[PDB]
Subunit: 208 residues, 3 copies
């Protein structure tokens, strides 16, 4: 077990290893209940190729145990073809030599800043979860998620947003997750409330 206690996770930066995984600051993962370091959470991601899709995780993300990000696009499976069998990849069989490569990229998988991901939540290829979004446990994300949206379910569907639309708009504008640490510590007292408007002022002020 890469982890010592169910109550102690480790930084992404201190455990990520596949070059095609770009994690941000302070984002962490706690997988004591799945025992593997964060690298194995990225399924089918080639550490070799620069040609593949990449998993990108924003800053300040708290990631639950056993989360999984399915990669490698279709894996050479074309549902619109007469057969979903990856003939092209089945080398040995000489008969399958003429097979064309049905593989298709899907685009980098992007997880925004401050995304709270539930244990065992699974993300399909190419999704883009927005900042602040909250992914429920066991949630199977099959599409893009909006900033500050609370989703959950198989398939995952938005249940509501964390703040008002205005609130959100303000949060998106001050982007505290990009704030110099000194200011994050400064505004700390306000980051522990739901007073977006207050925070917004404290921001506008400091900016001067």
């Amino acid at each position: 077990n890469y982890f010592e206690s169910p109550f102690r996770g480790k930084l992404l930066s201190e455990q990520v290893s596949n070059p095609n995984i770009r994690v941000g600051r302070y984002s962490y993962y706690s997988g004591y209940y799945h025992g593997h370091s964060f690298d194995d959470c990225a399924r089918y991601l080639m550490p070799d190729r620069d040609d593949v899709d990449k998993l990108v995780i924003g800053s300040f993300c708290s990631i639950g145990s056993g989360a999984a990000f399915i990669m490698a696009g279709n894996q050479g499976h074309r549902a619109e073809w007469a057969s979903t069998f990856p003939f092209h990849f089945m080398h040995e069989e000489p008969a399958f030599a003429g097979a064309v490569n049905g593989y298709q990229p899907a685009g980098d998988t992007l997880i925004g800043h401050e995304v709270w991901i539930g244990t065992e939540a699974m993300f399909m290829p190419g999704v883009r979860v927005g900042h602040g979004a909250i992914i429920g446990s066991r949630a199977l994300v099959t599409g893009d998620v909006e900033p500050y949206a609370i989703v959950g379910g198989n398939p995952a569907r938005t249940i509501r947003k964390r703040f008002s639309d205005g609130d959100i708009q303000n949060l998106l504008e001050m982007a505290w997750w990009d704030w110099p640490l000194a200011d994050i510590e400064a505004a700390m007292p306000l980051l522990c409330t739901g007073d977006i408007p207050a925070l917004y002022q404290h921001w506008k002020q400091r900016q001067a």
Copy 2:
């Protein structure tokens, strides 16, 4: 593997170990397909603190492999705050010193008597599954379940109840799961039918 065969489970009483887990008689768990004893089914449950929420399981429960009961309330994550990041818990960072503890208990998780839980069913913090309830496999229970309700799905939703409302009412009144063993063996022939009304009489009689 704590288990010898996919077809042989062990008593909760003979494997539970966290002091904050109170299992009842005859309730059993079979986790050959997940290999760990029942203690690891309670996620994030502190065996140390008397201050935490507890997992309580009634009598005569049959629990499928890999079931999981997510504990520790919010784990210090406040979705209504400007940030869902557990700053307070991120010690090292001196900047995060002023952070307030966003943690919140959720209440004991209660699983009634005779609850049949499917393999890999996952229960969220603070739910209360009622007696007789049947939890489908892979079912993600996010709220209270009623006695004799058959649920399933992500999110889990009642599909129907096992018996009539009257039937249920009778079952709830005689509470066979609390019956002295001699009477359980006695009424055995009737516990293997759907004749609640018959059982109810056999009960009323013996009571005299």
Copy 3:
């Protein structure tokens, strides 16, 4: 880990071992992320008894990691009885001696030809997935699936069919998955398109 790379699966024929598992040609499974060979994907399947239900997999199936086929019917759990507790199986307890066997078979689980099963998809007892069907990941299949249906979700529900009804009808008639290899290689160029009608002609012709 029975598997060497997340990108390299093995034939069912080269790893199946329970006698009650009948896999077809070219069908493969890649479980690097679950590390166990295909035999453990069949949950509660007795390799001993000829009396039990069997798991049957067609030809040309691509099976994702950690897929699972729940077997053993009800496992002796009768929801329509007053108790869902498998008394009959709880030997030790002499009191439970009179218990009747609530067990019930459910019928072989049949997975058709060319079924593409997503990682961690779980099939309940007795379902029958039709040829060409596509099972989404994490999909919990609780009932029969039609040929060329694309399902997903907990519970799994058809999202749409891969081809037209006519298209389907043609595909079902030529059954390429039963074609002598020489013809499969022959028609290879067409098996890599969505031109069912074209394929159908190429077929009708060769037949002469």
